[PDB]
């Protein structure tokens, strides 16, 4: 009834040893595509190679740094949700839960070359949202972790693709069943902000809030759980994010007379330009003036410079009146508040809807 996906990768962003069974795991595209997209989509005036500076130092502080460029299949493919949650923990509203998860992921990992890795990833995302290379097209989604095998610094993991959560058999734990586990920092239900009844079926989304200013950019990651419709979620999110939308509309771009067309077309006795002269023999004295309009529009907010969020459907919960449970348990050698979701069917294609308003 369910399907599985296997993949081997480097363990510098993901550790299937400490991560609990049932957590979310994401994958990354090849970093070589970032520069090819940045040098062509960077806003006019901005420096396009600050991303390259921010990117090179990331792998310089990562094992096997001489293995970038060929993509033979031995790169850091997958990553964990808690990793990004800890990298951007200074931006979530739940101060204590954020910093607790941060120190926990620092201690449970190598804890020697981990803090440097985190700050490199932090400004890496900061430079990612500096040239309109938004990190919602480079971060895909995998199902919850089910089984793993590791020998040293290289792991083979398998996760569910789509279907019921407790329809698999992990077959090495105490029980043969697992449930979805998430850090309490990313969880954010919108219906209890929008003040509507929470009964019935609810969808799951991932959002990527963007802040665009001068030398100050921010990117969070929230796992929203709402009963709102497939497309109506966009109109719902704008009501809560109305501030950042207006901030971006004014601080997004930092790098002329009208014409009365309908007026002079409603009235006659205007200079006409019949097709007889556009045939193409002397098409300069025919169009000598005909108008001037002195018109040009170069610097204006595009629909891409005012974007502030991008969501995507992941799964639903058919059981009405969900009863998600939040509690603190040990994660390595530290305790972190995790929320436990039961009976969630994965599915849905990876299509991102961008909320630019």
């Amino acid at each position: 009834t369910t399907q599985l996906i296997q993949q081997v990768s480097l363990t510098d962003f993901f550790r299937p040893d400490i991560e609990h069974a049932g957590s979310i795991v994401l994958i990354l595209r090849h970093p070589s595509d970032m520069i090819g997209e940045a040098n062509t989509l960077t806003q006019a005036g901005r420096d396009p190679d600050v991303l390259l500076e921010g990117l090179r130092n990331l792998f310089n502080a990562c094992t096997a740094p001489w293995t970038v460029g060929e993509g033979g299949g031995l790169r850091a493919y997958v990553t964990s949700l808690s990793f990004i949650a800890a990298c951007r923990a200074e931006e979530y509203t739940d101060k204590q839960a954020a910093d607790a998860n941060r120190t926990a992921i620092v201690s449970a990992y190598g804890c020697s070359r981990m803090e440097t890795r985190l700050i490199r990833f932090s400004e890496c995302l900061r430079a990612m949202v500096q040239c309109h290379v938004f990190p919602h097209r480079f971060i895909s989604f995998f199902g919850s972790l089910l089984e793993y095998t590791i020998q040293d610094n290289l792991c083979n993991i398998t996760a569910v693709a789509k279907g019921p959560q407790e329809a698999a058999r992990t077959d090495k734990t105490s029980t043969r069943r697992v449930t979805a586990n998430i850090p309490a920092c990313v969880f954010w239900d919108v219906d209890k902000d929008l003040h509507l009844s929470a009964d019935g079926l609810k969808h799951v989304f991932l959002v990527f809030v963007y802040t665009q200013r001068r030398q100050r950019e921010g990117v969070r990651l929230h796992l929203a759980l709402s009963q709102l419709n497939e497309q109506c979620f966009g109109r719902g999110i704008g009501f809560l994010l109305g501030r950042i939308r207006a901030e971006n509309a004014a601080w997004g771009t930092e790098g002329t007379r009208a014409l009365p067309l309908v007026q002079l077309s409603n009235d006659p006795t205007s200079p006409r330009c019949s097709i007889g002269e556009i045939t193409g023999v002397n098409w300069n004295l025919a169009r000598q003036r005909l108008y001037q309009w002195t018109g040009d529009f170069r610097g204006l907010p595009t629909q891409l410079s005012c974007m502030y969020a991008a969501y995507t459907l992941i799964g639903t919960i058919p059981s009405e009146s969900v009863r998600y449970t939040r509690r603190m348990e040990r994660f390595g050698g530290y305790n972190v508040p995790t929320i436990w979701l039961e009976g969630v069917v994965w599915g849905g294609t990876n299509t991102w809807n961008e909320c630019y308003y």
Binding site: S32, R56, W66, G69, E70
Partner: protein, 48 residues
């Protein structure tokens, strides 16, 4: 060095009179691997 021509001629001269050298274009954000040669003679060469 403060002068780019200095280090460029340095790398050029060093590549001259050797076997393994970085490729001429010198790509940015790469691994800097030498160009593969034809068949091998008598075993894997060892660096000194």
């Amino acid at each position: 060095m403060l002068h780019d021509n200095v280090t460029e001629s340095l790398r050029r001269i060093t590549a001259s009179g050797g076997r393994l050298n970085p490729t001429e274009p010198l790509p940015i954000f790469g691994g800097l691997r030498p160009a593969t040669s034809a068949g091998i003679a008598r075993g894997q060469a060892s660096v000194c």
